[PDB]
Symmetry: C3
Subunit: 735 residues, 3 copies
């Protein structure tokens, strides 16, 4: 009832002073104030380019070639400053200054006294400022250095040079994609990109509450849950404090346990009844339960601290296939609550190049995966680690999370200084995320980094989850169809974004892609949205993937912009849909497919199926119809085709299915089928049809009508005849 702890936000308006970084970087408050620079208003959480654009000092980086105009600020320093009132601290309490995100190399001062030196963009930074804080008004100053210039303080190994990830990224703990990628612009940025708060703690406080599902019995509605509790506990308070442990759901108390605190750290085991297991989408309900622990004085009832979260009773195992194709990647399958689950989902890339806006995108971005019905998502190591709320949403909606540690495409230093920086980061992120039921896998894609540093962290701080040391042309080419990986990471096909997105990110004279009307030659602004990392004038490159892919499927590249959008999105839609159906149709050998990708992190031309502004490409709806719990699909056979139905649930379903020709209306097949639980079931073999065309699949399950299709024949097709088949099928609108 009575609250003896509190958290006061330091978010809001700050003062931001920026200037070019001298040869000797500015480290002190006196140097930052004596330096000659520009002072503007800043918003925390934020990025400095946001503050600068609000002051009219930079142009919108999302339009045209404006991204290259931010180049000089990579060599700048950034000085945050504000005042704050210190909260009332009683005798023994501790005041903690909390940073959710400092980007990156910065000296932190409170009342002119240094309290910390941050050097990791991806993790939290907490400082005990109890003794340095004064009565009344206090000063908080953060002086950030240039991340790019920090790289030259290090001598690189041979393996760290020439990778797709930037050499500037190798010796520093930052998201590698911020230096530029083929799917993200170069925007190093800086600033306080997550919350800054002031926490008041009691001498008796919870240091960590670690919930672990030892076992789960779904049929009996039981589970065994362990609580690893670490606290600060003055010895005078030993035997005078009790832990109050509650499992509840919507106010209704499931279990209550109280235990006297005779030592600072304890293991409490809870044997629960009447509790449902946590399942990913399709395989059941994502049952969640409020788990709460409080440190309570046994005499006065004083609540010294309380930790509350929603946990899910679930076990996860990575069943390795060590018989078939030893050494091949993807020879494994996820086992959730003892059931082998078929994984299907997207790779997760940055939500925004200015990551202070990540949090405002996460609700609608997770809703993309919910509408798609992904049961898994892989957080790519090129991005930052997402915050707690992303994993809360994945807990709530039953989306399993595969978490890469933040590494780019390359090899890294084997020396002690880098190993210590990565270990501190790994321990921080693991302790923070290890209680979310949606998280199922750590990945660190011999190397000391992947085979020793990260493995020792998972071994000591998360024994409950598996760890993995390591991770164009025609879509029916043998490079795709002959891949024997059970669990594949699909490469992705390009898709020209919607017209409204093109007209929003390109200048009016650059909306049309063809330079001087020459089909195949991209203008300079389209080359920038390749993404082109550096401002280098050249022709061709990554954008030629759009034309070469429509030239294989449709023979010729349309000159009209609207017809080019249809051709490009159609190739992307057919390719990605074909890859999902190919893996779902070849179960039980195939065990999962994680495709690239569902959402852009910036207005760009990419292989994502939905752009930065929420513009869904045609591939999104194609993929949606092949991601259902029960899906009737058609795989190519040696002679003819094979109508199949795949089931990613633990329940049996029945229904009827009808396969017809879209152009002639003739019935190729129509029969009743039994879709057995958690397996692929072949229905019937279909003969080869004459020439090109399309087949329409119409199946009915439990009074619900679902629709699919299959494009038969060999390319090249005629773009206008394919358009007629889409309209005559009645499933997907043209545009």
């Amino acid at each position: 009832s009575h609250m003896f702890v509190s958290e006061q936000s330091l978010n809001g308006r700050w003062t931001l002073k920026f200037f070019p970084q001298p040869a000797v970087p500015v480290m002190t408050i006196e140097g930052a104030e004596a330096a000659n620079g520009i002072v503007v208003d800043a918003v925390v959480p934020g990025n400095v380019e946001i503050d600068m654009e609000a002051a009219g000092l930079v142009e919108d980086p999302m339009v045209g070639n404006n991204i290259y105009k931010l180049r000089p600020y990579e060599g700048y320093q950034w000085y945050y400053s504000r005042t704050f009132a210190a909260p009332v601290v009683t005798e023994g309490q501790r005041l903690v200054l909390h940073f959710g995100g400092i980007d990156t190399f910065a000296e932190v001062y409170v009342n002119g006294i240094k309290v910390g030196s941050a050097d990791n963009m991806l993790i939290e930074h907490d400082y005990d400022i109890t003794s340095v804080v004064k009565e009344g008004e206090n000063r908080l100053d953060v002086i950030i250095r240039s991340s790019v210039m920090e790289a030259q303080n290090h001598f690189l190994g041979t393996l760290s040079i020439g990778n797709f990830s930037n050499e500037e990224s190798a010796p520093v703990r930052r998201a590698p994609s911020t230096y530029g990628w083929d799917i993200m612009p170069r925007l190093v940025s800086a600033g306080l990109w997550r919350d800054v708060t002031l926490r008041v703690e009691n001498p008796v406080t919870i240091v960590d509450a670690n919930w672990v599902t030892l076992s789960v019995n779904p049929k009996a509605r039981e589970a065994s849950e362990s609580l690893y509790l670490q606290t600060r506990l003055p010895f005078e308070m030993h035997d005078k404090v009790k832990a109050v442990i509650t499992i509840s759901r919507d106010g209704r108390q499931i279990l209550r346990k109280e235990a006297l605190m005779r030592k600072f750290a304890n293991l409490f085991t809870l044997n629960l009844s009447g509790v449902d297991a946590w399942w990913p989408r399709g395989y059941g309900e994502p049952a969640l339960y409020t788990a709460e622990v409080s440190l309570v004085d046994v005499t006065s009832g004083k609540i010294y601290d309380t930790k509350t979260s929603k946990i899910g009773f679930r076990t996860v195992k990575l069943e390795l296939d060590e018989v078939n194709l030893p050494g091949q990647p993807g020879q494994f399958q996820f086992i959730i609550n003892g059931e082998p689950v078929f994984a299907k989902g997207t790779n997760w890339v940055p939500l925004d190049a200015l990551h202070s806006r990540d949090a405002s995108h996460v609700e609608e971005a997770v809703q993309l995966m919910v509408e798609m019905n992904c049961n898994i998502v892989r957080c790519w190591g090129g991005n930052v680690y997402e915050d707690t709320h992303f994993f809360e949403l994945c807990d709530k909606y039953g989306i399993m999370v595969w978490q890469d540690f933040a590494m780019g495409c390359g090899n890294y230093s084997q020396r002690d200084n880098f190993a210590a920086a990565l270990e501190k980061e790994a321990i921080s992120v693991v302790v923070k995320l290890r209680n979310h039921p949606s998280l199922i896998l750590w990945s660190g894609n011999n190397d000391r980094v992947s085979r020793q540093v990260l493995s020792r962290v998972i071994y000591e701080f998360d024994p409950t989850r598996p760890y993995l040391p390591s991770s164009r042309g025609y879509y029916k080419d043998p490079f795709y169809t002959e891949n024997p990986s059970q669990f594949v990471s699909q490469i992705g096909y390009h898709g020209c974004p919607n017209r409204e997105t093109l007209e929003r990110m390109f200048s009016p004279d650059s909306v049309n892609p063809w330079q001087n009307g020459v089909v195949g030659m991209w203008n300079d602004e389209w080359q920038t949205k390749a993404n082109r990392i550096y401002d280098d004038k050249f022709q061709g490159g990554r954008n030629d993937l759009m034309t070469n892919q429509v030239r294989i499927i449709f023979g010729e590249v349309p000159a009209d912009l609207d017809d080019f959008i249809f051709a490009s999105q159609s190739v992307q839609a057919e390719a990605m849909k074909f890859f999902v159906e190919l893996w779902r149709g070849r179960r039980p050998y195939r065990t999962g497919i994680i495709w690239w990708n569902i959402r852009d992190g910036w207005p760009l031309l990419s292989d994502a199926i939905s752009d930065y502004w929420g513009g869904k490409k045609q591939a999104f709806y194609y993929m949606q119809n092949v991601h259902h719990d029960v899906c009737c699909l058609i795989n190519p056979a040696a002679n003819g085709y094979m109508l199949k139905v795949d089931n990613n649930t633990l329940k049996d379903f029945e229904g009827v299915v009808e396969v017809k020709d879209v152009a002639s209306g003739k019935q190729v097949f129509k029969g009743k089928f039994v879709s057995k639980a958690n397996q692929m079931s072949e229905i019937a073999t279909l003969p080869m049809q004459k020439g090109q065309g399309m087949l329409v699949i119409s199946y009915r399950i439990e009074g619900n009508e679902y629709f699919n299709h299959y494009l038969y024949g060999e390319p090249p097709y005629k773009l206008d005849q394919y358009r007629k088949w889409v309209k005559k099928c009645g499933i997907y609108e043209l545009e």
Copy 2:
């Protein structure tokens, strides 16, 4: 000025494996005897204090840092053995070529060997091929023959003795012949011995009284006729006198490093504290013939 051991534990963040074991979470990040926090066979009595000797030592510029005696080979029927002396010293350079090591093996006044060697460097290996020496055996398999091994540093001209190290060694070889836990056998001087003995637990919850119990407690093993004793990792390491008695009565010693009943930290901080401890205890005890096994 001693601090609270229990409270020191809260200066550390424990890994999952260190929580919930039978050994106390307070024991996991500190280098103390785990049984002092309580056990099923020992009371909780954390205690504190200067529980062993406090002395002032005066050393000369020339001094012996370590005298490490190693038995390379033994031939009991021929009454021979090859003994190595690994000698480390502090030696000013002006004292190089001016000091000699005097190595003497003796048994009850009878001198077995007297070798003198000019000190030309600070560390040296002296091989001693001995005659008329009996091998060291555990109880039942023969005599626990011990010899006084003495090394002294002596000025060549003035004859002044700068330092002297003296202990009783035994000429013995130990091999662990492997063949499921416990699939091994101790080979002592080439013979396969059948081991029979007890585990060794704290002599007292107040460990400053261990030294007053060790004579009678070892006599329990002599009356019992144990030929082996396993010093439990829940206890402190026994002092030199315990191993002196085990040398004398022919009781082999299997020594656990001081670990509780659970997994420990994997971070560099704990590894550095444990390495320092292990180097200290190994150098202190590696010269006793009774000691035959280290266990982690």
Copy 3:
């Protein structure tokens, strides 16, 4: 001011496997040539002093930290080769996009290959596909063909 190398060895407690070897115990904990303490083919002469050149060097803010040449592949029959240059430089941020790297492979004054690239970052990997070059062979197996490889950091505006 140089100290005694011999006396430095007594700052270290030696392990058992470091005592009794052919090399001196004084050699085990120090980073010196072990033969200086004596061997069966070299006398004992510890010595001391500044035994190699001492120089004062002046470096520009734009300077080459390391030029690492690596032969990926070679085809001696076709007189072709693939050479990589792992270049690490010191580069103030003001000089980013204003300096170019100039790479020249030559032999006895005749130029074989030349490549220019704008320095956009401090470290770079350059790939050179070379024609008309001979492979390096040990004695007997061919000629020890060498080529002068030069890299320079050049101001794109003034040519300095």
